[PDB]
């Protein structure tokens, strides 16, 4: 059968409702991109450690978020990342 791989943006929204990290990995894995969650910078007080995380998807670096912890940073980035992708397709001519 014909391999039909369409932009299933609706399921990216399901990941916002479930697990953003897995969704960002899913989007990349299906689109031939690599999803790299790296820590950019760590600048924050001892009581509020600020971790700047950025999602490197292929040759793009987006987004850049600053969370209160490492596990948070991954998720905050992935959440925003999917929302970028979704927002890019909504009202898009591309």
Swiss-Prot record:
Tell me the disulfide pairings in this chain. none
On modification after translation, the UniProt record reads:
Sumoylation reduces RNA-editing activity.
Share the domain note from the entry: The third dsRNA-binding domain (DRBM 3) contains an additional N-terminal alpha-helix that is part of a bi-partite nuclear localization signal, together with the sequence immediately C-terminal to DRBM 3. The presence of DRBM 3 is important to bring together the N-terminal and the C-terminal part of the bi-partite nuclear localization signal for import mediated by TNPO1. RNA binding interferes with nuclear import.
* All residue ranges annotated as the DRBM domain in the record: 19-87
- Residue range from the parent sequence: 708 to 801 of 1226
**What disease has this protein been linked to?**
Dyschromatosis symmetrica hereditaria: An autosomal dominant pigmentary genodermatosis characterized by a mixture of hyperpigmented and hypopigmented macules distributed on the face and the dorsal parts of the hands and feet, that appear in infancy or early childhood. Aicardi-Goutieres syndrome 6: A form of Aicardi-Goutieres syndrome, a genetically heterogeneous disease characterized by cerebral atrophy, leukoencephalopathy, intracranial calcifications, chronic cerebrospinal fluid (CSF) lymphocytosis, increased CSF alpha-interferon, and negative serologic investigations for common prenatal infection. Clinical features as thrombocytopenia, hepatosplenomegaly and elevated hepatic transaminases along with intermittent fever may erroneously suggest an infective process.
Q: What is this protein called?
A: Double-stranded RNA-specific adenosine deaminase
Subunit: Homodimer. Homodimerization is essential for its catalytic activity. Isoform 5 can form heterodimers with ADARB1/ADAR2. Isoform 1 interacts with ILF2/NF45 and ILF3/NF90. Binding to ILF3/NF90 up-regulates ILF3-mediated gene expression. Isoform 1 and isoform 5 (via DRBM 3 domain) interact with TNPO1. Isoform 5 (via DRBM domains) interacts with XPO5. Isoform 1 and isoform 5 can interact with EIF2AK2/PKR and UPF1.
Q: Which domain of life is it from?
A: Eukaryota
Expression sites by tissue: Ubiquitously expressed, highest levels were found in brain and lung. Isoform 5 is expressed at higher levels in astrocytomas as compared to normal brain tissue and expression increases strikingly with the severity of the tumor, being higher in the most aggressive tumors.
Segments for region (N-terminal extension of DRBM 3 and constituent of a bi-partite nuclear localization signal): 9-18
Quote the function comment for this protein: Catalyzes the hydrolytic deamination of adenosine to inosine in double-stranded RNA (dsRNA) referred to as A-to-I RNA editing.
Induction summary: Isoform 1 is induced by interferon alpha. Isoform 5 is constitutively expressed.
For region C-terminal extension of DRBM 3 and constituent of a bi-partite nuclear localization signal, the annotated ranges are 88-94
